Design an enzyme around this catalytic site. Structure first.
Site, short mmCIF file in Angstrom:
data_model
loop_
_atom_site.label_atom_id
_atom_site.label_comp_id
_atom_site.label_asym_id
_atom_site.label_seq_id
_atom_site.Cartn_x
_atom_site.Cartn_y
_atom_site.Cartn_z
N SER C 117 37.14 -27.83 -14.94
CA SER C 117 37.34 -29.25 -15.21
C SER C 117 38.81 -29.55 -14.93
O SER C 117 39.68 -29.06 -15.64
CB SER C 117 36.98 -29.60 -16.64
N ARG C 118 39.07 -30.35 -13.89
CA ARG C 118 40.46 -30.59 -13.51
C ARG C 118 41.24 -31.26 -14.64
O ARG C 118 42.41 -30.94 -14.86
CB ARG C 118 40.53 -31.45 -12.25
N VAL C 119 40.61 -32.20 -15.35
CA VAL C 119 41.33 -32.90 -16.41
C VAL C 119 41.79 -31.90 -17.47
O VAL C 119 42.95 -31.92 -17.90
CB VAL C 119 40.47 -34.02 -17.02
N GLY C 120 40.90 -31.00 -17.88
CA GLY C 120 41.27 -29.94 -18.79
C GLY C 120 41.97 -30.43 -20.05
O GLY C 120 41.35 -31.06 -20.91
#
Lengths: 47, 55, 128
Positions: C117-120
């Site tokens: 998940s890029r947002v993380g």
């Protein structure tokens, strides 16, 4: 069709994970031993 | 599987076979040496057991 | 509509691997030349123009948002297929479900090793 070095861990089958674990457990053990020795040297070199 | 899966699996098994052949050769050499050293130790140990089976 | 009117929406396409098949049938029956695996050339566009509408408007444009959870279906775990790779390179995160984990007792089968998940950090409560 040939074979190349470092192919067992490229497939990632059962042998790949088995080898990865056989390496990681051994080096965790050695890291623990080396950290103990490092602590001992730290204490013995304070003075 | 796909072609890349099969290729990787085939390469891995080929490496495994090479390694097991080498280990068989090493084990055979060590076995020959072990038998050679086992003969005299066989006589020595049998002698050392001699007493208890005789008395 | 919701995201443009300050509200929040969640959309779940289920599956996109069947929209791709329907598009391929349409394109083949219009006589447009096929491509790879018979899918038309515009099969990436088909999805990229669709998943790019899941935005997060700033507070000047209402502040509304539209999350998207496309569902793809791989064949025997061949994530390397055509539509799976297209959509993986389109989306932000991924949630890999694996049958070996489903039968080993791990349900949901989420493969936490590969799931990303890029947002993380962002978009997570402080306690979590």
């Amino acid at each position: 069709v040939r074979s190349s070095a470092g192919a067992v861990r490229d497939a990632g089958g059962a042998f790949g994970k088995r080898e990865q674990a056989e390496e990681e457990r051994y080096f965790r053990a050695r890291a623990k031993e080396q950290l103990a020795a490092l602590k001992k040297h730290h204490e013995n070199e304070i003075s | 599987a796909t072609l890349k899966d099969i290729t990787r699996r085939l390469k891995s098994i080929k490496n495994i076979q090479k390694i097991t052949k080498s280990m068989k050769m090493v084990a055979a050499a060590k076995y020959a040496r072990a038998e050679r050293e086992l003969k005299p130790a066989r006589v020595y140990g049998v002698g050392s057991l001699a007493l208890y089976e005789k008395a | 509509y919701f995201r443009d009117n300050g509200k929040h929406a969640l959309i779940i396409y289920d599956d996109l691997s069947k929209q791709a098949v329907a598009y391929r049938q349409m394109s083949l029956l219009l006589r447009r030349p096929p491509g790879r695996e018979a899918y038309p050339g515009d099969v990436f566009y088909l999805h990229s123009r669709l998943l790019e509408r899941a935005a997060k408007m700033n507070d000047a444009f209402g502040g509304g948002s539209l999350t998207a959870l496309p569902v793809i279906e791989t064949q025997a775990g061949d994530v390397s297929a055509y539509i799976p790779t297209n959509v993986i390179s389109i989306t932000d995160g991924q949630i890999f479900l694996e049958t070996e984990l489903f039968y080993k007792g791990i349900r949901p089968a989420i493969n936490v090793g590969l799931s990303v998940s890029r947002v993380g950090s962002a978009a997570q409560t402080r306690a979590m």
